[PDB]
Amino acid sequence: GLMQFTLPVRLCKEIELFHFDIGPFENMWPGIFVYMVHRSCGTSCFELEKLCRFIMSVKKNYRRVPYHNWKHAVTVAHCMYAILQNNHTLFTDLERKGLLIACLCHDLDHRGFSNSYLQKFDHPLAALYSTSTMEQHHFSQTVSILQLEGHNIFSTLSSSEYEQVLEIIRKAIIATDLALYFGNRKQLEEMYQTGSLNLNNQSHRDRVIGLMMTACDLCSVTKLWPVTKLTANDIYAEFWAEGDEMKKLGIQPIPMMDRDKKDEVPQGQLGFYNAVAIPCYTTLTQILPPTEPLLKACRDNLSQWEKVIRGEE
Ligand SMILES: Cc1ncc(C)n2nc(CNc3nc(-c4ccccc4)nn3C)nc12
Numbered sequence: 001g002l003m004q005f006t007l008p009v010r011l012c013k014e015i016e017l018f019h020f021d022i023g024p025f026e027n028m029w030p031g032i033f034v035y036m037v038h039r040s041c042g043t044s045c046f047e048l049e050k051l052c053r054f055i056m057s058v059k060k061n062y063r064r065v066p067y068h069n070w071k072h073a074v075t076v077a078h079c080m081y082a083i084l085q086n087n088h089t090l091f092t093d094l095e096r097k098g099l100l101i102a103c104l105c106h107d108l109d110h111r112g113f114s115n116s117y118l119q120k121f122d123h124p125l126a127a128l129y130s131t132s133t134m135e136q137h138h139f140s141q142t143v144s145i146l147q148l149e150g151h152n153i154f155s156t157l158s159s160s161e162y163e164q165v166l167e168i169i170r171k172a173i174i175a176t177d178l179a180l181y182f183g184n185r186k187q188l189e190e191m192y193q194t195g196s197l198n199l200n201n202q203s204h205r206d207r208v209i210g211l212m213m214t215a216c217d218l219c220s221v222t223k224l225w226p227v228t229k230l231t232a233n234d235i236y237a238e239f240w241a242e243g244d245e246m247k248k249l250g251i252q253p254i255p256m257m258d259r260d261k262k263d264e265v266p267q268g269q270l271g272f273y274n275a276v277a278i279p280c281y282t283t284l285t286q287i288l289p290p291t292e293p294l295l296k297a298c299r300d301n302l303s304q305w306e307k308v309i310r311g312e313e
């Protein structure tokens with residue numbers, strides 16, 4: 001119980017900032033996550049041995065895909081850690097616990113294909129779950145790992161604390177379905193502006209945690225430009241593989257997924273920052289003012305994509 005994880009000095013200082021990159025050394029990512037659990041939650045939250053066994057099973061159930069991989073899982077958990085550490089007193093003991101686990105688990109067993117591709121291929125998961133197909137699968141795999149021998153990291157909670165934390169994780173993982181983000185952010189925008197937003201209304205917290213999840217999920221756009229730019233190559237490598245698979249089903253993919261329309265990526269990134277990213281971090285900043293560095297970095301990256309279009313980069 002006296003075994004604190006510590007990080008080298010550059011990582012000790014830089015892990016606290018929103019724009020931190022967890023680096024290319026896979027074997028350090030588990031320790032980075034435990035460090036984050038220990039500071040956002042406590043050395044007491046999880047039995048170390050159960051946590052390590054859960055982490056390694058979560059890792060093993062992420063696939064070797066260009067973007068939706070173990071590195072993405074730990075990156076999304078780190079953004080959540082930053083939001084939680086900059087908003088100390090706004091979140092319950094169970095939310096702290098649940099939300100870093102939700103982020104680590106949110107894309108479990110992803111195959112690098114959209115819900116839309118599963119539906120057109122007619123994948124078994126598309127009959128088991130007609131909306132948020134992959135996200136219901138991700139939650140399902142989380143409950144699976146939680147029920148392996150020696151993996152119940154929540155075993156010290158009561159039946160009802162346990163049920164609340166699995167309910168927090170389910171909603172949080174479901175909210176990572178970008179189709180659901182637009183409606184959720186519109187409602188939050190309206191509630192905040194008409195002054196009805198109430199962080200004691202459970203159905204309001206839910207929406208606020210959904211938006212945090214979208215924020216953490218999209219956080220590649222809040223990094224240093226060279227991280228953002230190199231991550232975008234991973235993002236399009238998945239989309240263009242799905243594009244090819246659409247063409248194999250005899251379907252012209254949307255241009256986002258057509259490797260023949262590589263040229264239009266800079267303009268596609270503008271659409272994406274304007275329609276999804278900027279609105280996301282704006283509304284988050286309105287609700288949680290200390291998350292402003294995320295909006296500031298996103299804006300800086302929009303401006304870098306604008307330079308790419310002007311041939312300045
Ligand atoms: C950075 C980032 N993080 C997360 C997600 C989910 N995405 N999704 C995109 C894709 N955005 C996008 N690309 C194109 C496009 C691309 C090439 C040609 C034509 C159009 N249009 N749009 C809207 N970028 C991101």
Ligand SMILES: [Mg+2]
Binds near residue numbers: 106107134176177
């Ligand atoms: Mg996902």
Ligand SMILES: [Zn+2]
Binds near residue numbers: 072076107176217
């Ligand atoms: Zn994700």
